[PDB]
Every structure is written in C-alpha cells, then in structure tokens.
Design a protein around this nucleic acid. Structure first.
Lengths: 111, 123
RNA sequence: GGAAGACCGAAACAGUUCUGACGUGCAAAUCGAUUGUCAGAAUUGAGUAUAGGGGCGAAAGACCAAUCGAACCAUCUAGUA
RNA sequence: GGUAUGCGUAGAAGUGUUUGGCGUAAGCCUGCAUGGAGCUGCCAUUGGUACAGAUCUUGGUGGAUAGUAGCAAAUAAUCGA
RNA sequence: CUAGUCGAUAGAAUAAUGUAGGUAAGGGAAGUCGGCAAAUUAGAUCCGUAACUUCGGGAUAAGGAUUGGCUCUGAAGAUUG
RNA sequence: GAACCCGCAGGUACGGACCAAUGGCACAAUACUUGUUCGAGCGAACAGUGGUAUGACGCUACGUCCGUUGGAUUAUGCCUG
RNA sequence: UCACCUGAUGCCGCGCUAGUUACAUAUAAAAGCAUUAUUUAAUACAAUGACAAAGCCUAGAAUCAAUUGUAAACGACUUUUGUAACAGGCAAGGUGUUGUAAGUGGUUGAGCAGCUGCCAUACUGCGAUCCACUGAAGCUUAUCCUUUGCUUGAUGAUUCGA
C-alpha cells in the first residue's frame, strides 16, 4: 500500500537480448531495462541513473555482462506534479560471485 | 484508405485499418481547449456538452522543392488544414408534427356511416 | 659499384572485366569490388598564342563550355512544303 | 451613326438555380439569392466575332497518394541534469 | 596519443526477393557463349630451375623444405691502448 | 528360351511431410591468438564478423518415415437369338 | 413439443342442422337514372408496430489493449491470469556445452644469472610450459525439463440483445 519499497533485484540480461543483432545490443539493453523494471514494478518513468552506464557500456557494445544487480527504488516524485507520481530509481551494486545470491527486498528506505 | 496496412484495435470501427497520428492529435488537443475555454465565458457547465458538428478542409499549399534525376525539379507541397468545431449541449431531435386536409360534402360521409354507423363494428 | 623510356606496389592519375550495386540516382556519368603504369612520350596551378566552313587533332571525324560530319547568339525569318 | 418622351443606388453588367415558360434549334424572356455603376431592343452599317479538339500556348487541380513511392553508402550512439 | 567529429530520419521487427561479407559432407567444369564472379597462391631466408633466346632473358619459372613463444651461447664497433 | 499368371523381395522419378540419430550452416557462447591501448593479472577491449576449432536450439537434405480403393462401361472376345 | 388411444377427472346436457306452415319486426333506396372511377373498403382474417394500458420470466459475454509461443511481413491464430491450486521474476537441481579457470602452492623445467658463502654448497627476485586443489570454470531459454526453496501479483478500458 505504501509502495515506496526498495528491492534488491537480479537480472538475466543476455536472455532478454537474444533476437537482436549486435551493434544494437546493447543500447538495446538499456531500453530493455525499461521493460525489465516495470514488469516487476508497474510504474512508468524508469529514470536509469548514470552509474548503470559505466558497467553496461563497460565491455562495450558487444556484450553487457550477463548479470547485474540493480536496486529497484520506487521513489516518490517530490515535485513536478504530473499525473504520474511513483517513478523508479536504479543504481549499481557490483557483486561478483554469482551462485545462489538471492533476490529480496531488505533495504532501508534511505541508503 | 491505404496503404495503411493493419492494426488490431480498430475492430470497434469494424474495418481493420488504423493509425495514431501524433501531429494530428496535438493540434486538436489544444484546439479542443480553445473550444473548451469559450463556454466557460458563457457560464455553461461543460459536462453536459457533446461534440456536435466537425469538419476539416484544405488550404493554400506552399511550394518547397525537391531535386531529381537528369537535372529536374518537382514540388514538395504539404497541404495545411482548417479545423472547425461547434459544441452543443445535450439536446433533443425532432421528427415533425403534421396535420391532414379533408373536404367533406354531401356524398362522402355516408360511406363512413355505411362501415361505422349502420354496421356496428365490434372492437 | 646503381645506370636504363627495366619490375610488384601508395597518395597522383587513369577507367578494364564484373556486362554486379541505384538507372523518377549520389549523379544530364557516379559509388563499391576488381586491373595498369608509377622516376618520364610522365603528372600539373597560374600566365600567353590559336577562331565558325575554321582552331586543333601520338588520327576517333575525337575535342572547342552538358552541343561537333560544323557549333554557339540576333537577323534577311511568320523563310518553303 | 440613326432610333424608342428606353429601364438605372426604390439595384444596372455578369454569377449561381430542386421558381415558371416560349423555338424545330441556336438562343431569350422570367423568379429568388449574391452583387455595387452602368447597360440592352427594332434598322441602317460593320471587326482582332461564337471552340471539345491542334504530341495546341498559360494559369489553377485530380485520381495513383495527398500519404503510397522511398529519404538504406561513410562502424554507433548513450543514460542523467 | 594529439587535435575533432557522432553529421547522414527515427524508436521498433526477424517475410520473400534484392543489396554487399561468408562457410557447406561428396565429386570437382559436368555447368555456361566462354573458367566469368568467386577459391587456392601470396612475405623472407635455403636450395632447386626446363625448352627458346638478339645470349641483356624466359626467372618469382616451375618443383620443395623451412618459418611461434620462451631460454641461451657464437659473431659485426667506438673512446682511453 | 516363357523373369509366363502370381507371390516375394527390392529399386527409379516426382509426390506429401518430419529431425531420433548422421550430414551440413553456427548460442560470434566459449578455449589456443596476432597488432594496439587499457601500468602490470581477467577479458575476447576495438580492426565495420579479426582468422582459426569444436559447438547444443532450431531450420534443412545428402538423411529419415510414408503415398490408395469403389463403380460404369469403349478395343474386344463370347452369351442367347 | 407435437396429433392418436387409454387411466380417469368430470355431468355442456352452453350452442345442433334439415323439410313444411304461420307470426313479431327491425334494417335496407348514393335523382346516380346513357353513375362508376386516383375503384371505397368495413366485417373478418392474419400481419403488425407504437402508446399508458396486461400478468409473468430474466440475472452475460465479446472486443482489443497486456500477454504468451504450438503462430508471425503485419492482422489473424493457441492460451493465460483463487490473497495465488497458477501466472511471473529468481535461485536451486537435472540436461547439455566448450575442455580442466582464477587463486595459491608445486620436483615443473631449456637454463641462465645474483649468493652459489668455508663450512650446510643454499634462496630465487628470473622460468615458455607442465602438475595438484580440477571433468574446474563460464555459458544453459531468449523459441529447455524440473519446484514443496525464494520473492513478486487483482484496482483496466470498449462494444453488444433474439
């Protein structure tokens, strides 16, 4: 009901991005974050923060690394009172040891 | 009518060709406030308004230019529109109220009496 | 010891076969693969000559301003059929 | 040029027309609606005199499309303010 | 690196055919006008070089071997002898 | 010398399909790898797919599994007359 | 549902018809008199629909959007949505796929150098690769199989009546 919640997600990203060529993978993989967000969130203006670019355009266009750990932060719009009010904030959590690193929500609402 | 090939949603309009014209739906959206901000001068509550009567015509074309094969030139005319809208209230429609013309004389009423008066019609 | 109109090759130029890419183009001739010469008969910016039945032509009637078996522009020209 | 004490801002020329009519027919007469300053009938003459056409000249304008053709070469753009 | 550009309509979408860059087990010109697009060969060192020659060639003929990375010794100089 | 009638086995061409196996093409996922920057150690960082080898989903042929039974009646023999 | 017979309810005996004779009437005539004319129409029949009238019966789908993937140039076509049997994101198992990571350490070595010391003749800081921890490691549904682990989840619009 509060819906300001902040989960610690996980992602398969290459599995999102077969049936596209390379050279658009992967600046497709940040306009297929904007479906990966809202299928778990519903809300709209997914403001992708500039920390996530320096791991996605890190190898270059050819492959995003296949597993990110994004923090979905549905944070309320403080002003600009458009009819939309809940938007999502993403950041970058650079963990590296990916077997059984479970996805969850235990995150204090002011990191 | 085409070639706009298909899209799905237009089955409410029962023929399967449709589009979503971004520039053509900007210019009516402000205009339908430039309509909607005139009855509020007249003090009418705008809920009881519905769209009455709306047409769109053409106007004086431009002439920009294109350059083509073997040296030659053809026009590139984008042709503007006038949008006219009148918004009425939730009114009625009417058919007619009509009357009939008789001209009675000596030998036409009795036949009515031959079928109504002297022969008692059961209802 | 480094000479020759010597060779394979690059910006300089040329333009061959694909008869391939558009043939209402990128274009009133170009792009992309391919191929030839490449230290001289080489390549070239400027100055100056040459004139319409003639200039010029390592010779095809090529070229002379997108025109060339005679231009190009006004007339005798509403020339004749 | 002669002519009808010719109509004309109390609406004259053309423009439309599901008002009405005369010719065999070309063509007029007539009502309404624009319109704003000039016009026709008899009889003498007469000029650059009536158009479906000329691969006709010029100026709008169609269907195709008024949204199709296609805007594809030069590595490729991206989140946040 | 240094300087400077993302400027070529856009987000999307995996149909043909086309547009260009490819590999395809067998045989390998039968294919077709024709071995033409296309494939092998390609650098350098070591040999090894056929007929015809104007005795300058043909000559890179053909016909072959050899070619990393890492660890080492052997050699080619100058000043003060 | 009856490949007679038939039965049996098979085979050609097209025909309809699928993919278990095997052939192809590549999860451009991954291992060895040159050149350059990332200071050195991971990568596949970029050479418009670097080149190489194996390579699962599919899709496919060169592989695979399949493709048949009723009724009139010409040519004709006979039937009775 | 329907016509027929029967169990059997009941009692129309409401209304039948013909032939002869008598009676009580009412009605019936549009001079139109060489009349018809765009030939009514009532009755009755059924068809009706409308209006206030008449009792009864009745308590959903489709359509896109969003999906998914047995379909795909688009549309169409197969499906999906219990406060959660599931959808859906993940992890986890299994299937495979290259072949055996990085990390240390190693008798792992062509040796060359430093100290090779006085004795112990040693440490390596160099070493291409090999060996152990190791069939490791990354890839695995996007158009895989697996859930009792983990979390996410309903609140839309738009059309339609015999």
């Amino acid at each position: 009901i509060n819906e300001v919640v902040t989960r610690e997600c996980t992602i398969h990203l290459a599995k999102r991005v077969h049936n596209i060529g390379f050279k658009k993978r992967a600046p497709r993989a940040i306009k297929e974050i904007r479906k990966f967000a809202e299928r778990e969130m519903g809300t709209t203006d997914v403001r992708i923060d500039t920390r996530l670019n320096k791991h996605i355009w890190s190898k270059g266009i050819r492959s995003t690394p296949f597993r990110i750990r994004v923090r979905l932060a549905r944070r309320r719009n403080d002003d600009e009172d458009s009819p939309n009010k809940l938007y999502t904030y993403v950041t970058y959590v650079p963990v590296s040891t990916f077997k059984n690193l479970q996805t969850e929500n235990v995150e204090s609402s002011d990191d | 009518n085409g070639g706009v090939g298909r899209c799905a949603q237009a089955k409410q309009w029962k023929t399967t060709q449709g589009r979503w014209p971004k520039k053509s739906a900007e210019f009516l959206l402000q205009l339908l406030r430039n309509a909607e901000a005139n009855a509020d001068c007249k003090g009418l509550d705008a809920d009881r308004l519905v769209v009455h009567h709306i047409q769109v015509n053409r106007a004086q074309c431009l002439r920009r230019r294109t350059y083509r094969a073997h040296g030659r030139i053809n026009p590139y005319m984008s042709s503007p529109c006038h949008v006219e809208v009148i918004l009425t209230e939730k009114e009625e429609l009417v058919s007619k109220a009509t009357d009939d013309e008789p001209a009675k004389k000596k030998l036409s009423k009795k036949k009515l009496q031959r079928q109504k008066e002297k022969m008692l019609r059961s209802e």
